[PDB]
Design a protein around this ligand. Structure first.
Ligand SMILES: CN[C@@H](C)Cc1ccc2c(c1)OCO2
Lengths: 217, 208, 215, 212
């Protein structure tokens, strides 16, 4: 059983957005489907619920009716319409199933960012390993992704061929209003002269795909 | 209408109890692994769905219940959430969320320093990164010294989640200055203080 | 009865590719055919199926409609169109004949690698004998830093096969593949027999015959 | 839906069984088929329908179905049976073809110590500016092994990779190779190199080295 959400993204305050959840592996019409959201760095919050074949519908007062839940039982799809969106609605939204009085199937979630800030691709800079690496063979290298918005951003090394010692740090929101993080991998020093290291950074919100070579200096 | 302890530490192989105070009860517990969607742990005490390990157990207890975790293992790093259904308002309540720190042995951090790239320097800004890798506990002190003068305040720190395989942590301190400010000093150093160090460690470098 | 697949190769992510399967020995127009893929180091996964009359077609839901199956009964051929290729699509693709309720006849498979990495011919370095505690002598050839798969290694134009061990290619952190082929021969024959490794990496059109001599 | 155990070991001449567990929590009443895949070869059809065998499948292969679960029986094991075994059916809750995880058949054999070999980095390879050292573990059993590197008595880590061949179809043993990734600089930092292997069939860890 899989539940995949789509439609989340960056919208301005007061706008509207429609999210969809597609289910697989179970009878959609025979189960109840709910929406639950989580603010960045905050707790979980129930949003809405709908019964089998659109029998019973429930929401919460924190959203003063701005949200509308529906389902196409003949299409195994659930929809959530958000109107008069506010900055407080920014969060990751999940679709969940109700089986025995609790949520047993959760979706991966979709991020909705409500803000007047504009999208911007990130800049990738090399954190070049150099003489100031040493550490008895455990040299470090990496790439700095800076000044990007909205979230998120994904980083890989050598198209995925390098995964051991990789640490991609949580995004930090700078005073500029943009996000910045770094991805650093630790490798044996002896391997510096026998391999080229490239950071593959993907920022889908801005259609950014950058491969940056990290050379020692 | 549900409350959850902010934090809950543990040791490998031990047992941890996470409480969820409320007005009445059936409390259902969920786990939020680092960077992943929540998963169902227990419909009700001893009613764990398929896949969830038997190590987790519930406790049906009147107004206030709790969740028990035995054989504390690595992947148990997560924020735990409790939830019921207040039929009075026909709404689903949720707990504050408890973070599980899996106590491990003290691990010294590896300190790395990275000067700013020429690509960035051509752009007018200069960023400097100090790296603390695979240390325990999380608590550590990273200090930026530009010409022996502390510069913390223009820096910004990011800390990874508790690694499952090692239970360690990683931390990056980034010092950001303009090109002019960067060009007005020569000595750039990062100094780290942590439980696993007897003498503070310093990774330095010069502009040239 | 035989089934041969063709069209596999290296393609950039998001590209297209047409795979063809030719049958020789059975009434192709009288059987339903299928495409099934196996990823490197993973299990089998069904892809698509087409009936004899081209009336019934089923695809795996994970494809998102990126694949399109077809068949030419007039020429005894089966076709698969792969669009918006992803890294997950990298695998060996087989055609099969659905007789009764299983896959009766299988093809030999065709490898499809989806990656942005460029084709790289391997370097072949001799691994000469030294010292041995085994009373034998192991000598071989190291095929290093090549892409994509696969690489085929023989010894003395196929004459020498006994005691030969060609290791599975290991994808290094460098993003390139590497392997070693080693043969153990009686130590008394080191100075009186010629040992040649024939390494063929058809991608990149590399064929190298390297002689291993003690040193 | 279909679940298969990862590995299953047998004894030559003896009998071995493999299980393909289904689920209805999906459904059943489907026909489960069995396929065999030898290393480096496309799958071969073993069983289809009600324990039927096509053409070349011997009498030593049979398949049973009981509820949402089917099993494969291989009586009279041979070293040539070393392969990966899969099961397949036609799900109707998904209207697709579902395959099992597959099981790695591993016929047992006597405990075999490896014949260790060490190879010096090539003259050409050093010219390119890199040094690769190959440590060979030949025809040992069981699969588990532990290879360690040392250069001028300097222990290493994280700078080598190893590949292990499939179980041999005749002797049923394994051969393993481990390569060390060094560059001309670090290589010339030392002149003596060695490999230390420790295996169950071995009495005491062995070491082989070269001087140059
Ligand atoms: C879409 N054609 C189907 C009906 C043919 C089929 C059915 C069941 C199978 C199978 C193939 O492979 C193994 O289990």
């Amino acid at each position: 059983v899989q539940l995949l959400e789509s439609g989340g993204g960056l919208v301005q305050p007061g706008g509207s957005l429609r999210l969809s959840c597609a289910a697989s592996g179970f009878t959609f019409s025979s189960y109840e489907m709910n929406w639950v959201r989580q603010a960045p760095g905050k707790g979980l919050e129930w949003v809405s619920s709908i019964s089998s074949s659109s029998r019973y519908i429930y929401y919460a007062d924190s959203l003063k009716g701005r949200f509308t839940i529906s389902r196409d039982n003949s299409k195994n799809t659930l929809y959530l319409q958000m109107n008069s969106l506010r900055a407080e609605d920014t969060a990751v939204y999940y679709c969940a199933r109700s089986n025995h009085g609790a949520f047993d199937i959760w979706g991966q979630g979709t991020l909705v960012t409500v803000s007047s800030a504009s999208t911007k691709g990130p800049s990738v800079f090399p954190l070049a390993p150099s003489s100031k690496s040493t550490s008895g063979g455990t040299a470090a290298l990496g790439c700095l992704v800076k000044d990007y918005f909205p979230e998120p951003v994904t980083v890989s090394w050598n198209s995925g061929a390098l995964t051991s010692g990789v640490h991609t740090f949580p995004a930090v929101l700078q005073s500029s209003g943009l996000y910045s993080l770094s991805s650093v991998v630790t490798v044996p020093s002896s391997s510096l002269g026998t391999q080229t290291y490239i950071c593959n950074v993907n920022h889908k919100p801005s259609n950014t795909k950058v491969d940056k070579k990290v050379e020692p200096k | 209408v549900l409350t959850q302890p902010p934090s809950a530490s543990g040791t490998p192989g031990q047992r941890v109890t996470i409480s969820c105070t409320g007005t009445s009860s059936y409390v259902s517990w969920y786990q939020q692994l680092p960077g992943t969607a929540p998963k169902l742990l227990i419909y009700g005490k001893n009613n764990r769905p398929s896949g969830v390990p038997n190590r987790f157990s519930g406790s049906k207890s009147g107004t206030s219940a709790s969740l028990a975790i035995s054989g504390l293992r690595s992947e148990d790093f997560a924020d735990y959430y409790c939830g019921t259904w207040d039929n009075s308002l026909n709404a689903v309540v949720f707990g504050g969320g408890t973070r599980l720190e899996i106590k491990r042995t003290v691990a010294a951090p590896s300190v790395f320093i990275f000067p700013p790239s020429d690509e960035q320097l051509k752009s007018g800004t200069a960023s400097v990164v100090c790296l603390l890798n695979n240390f325990y506990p999380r608590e550590a002190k990273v200090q930026w010294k530009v010409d022996n003068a502390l510069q913390s305040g223009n820096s910004q720190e990011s800390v990874t989640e508790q690694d499952s395989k090692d239970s360690t942590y990683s931390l990056s301190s980034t010092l950001t200055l303009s090109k002019a400010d960067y060009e007005k000093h020569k000595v750039y150093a990062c100094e780290v203080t942590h439980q696993g160090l007897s003498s503070p460690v310093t990774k330095s470098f010069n502009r040239g």
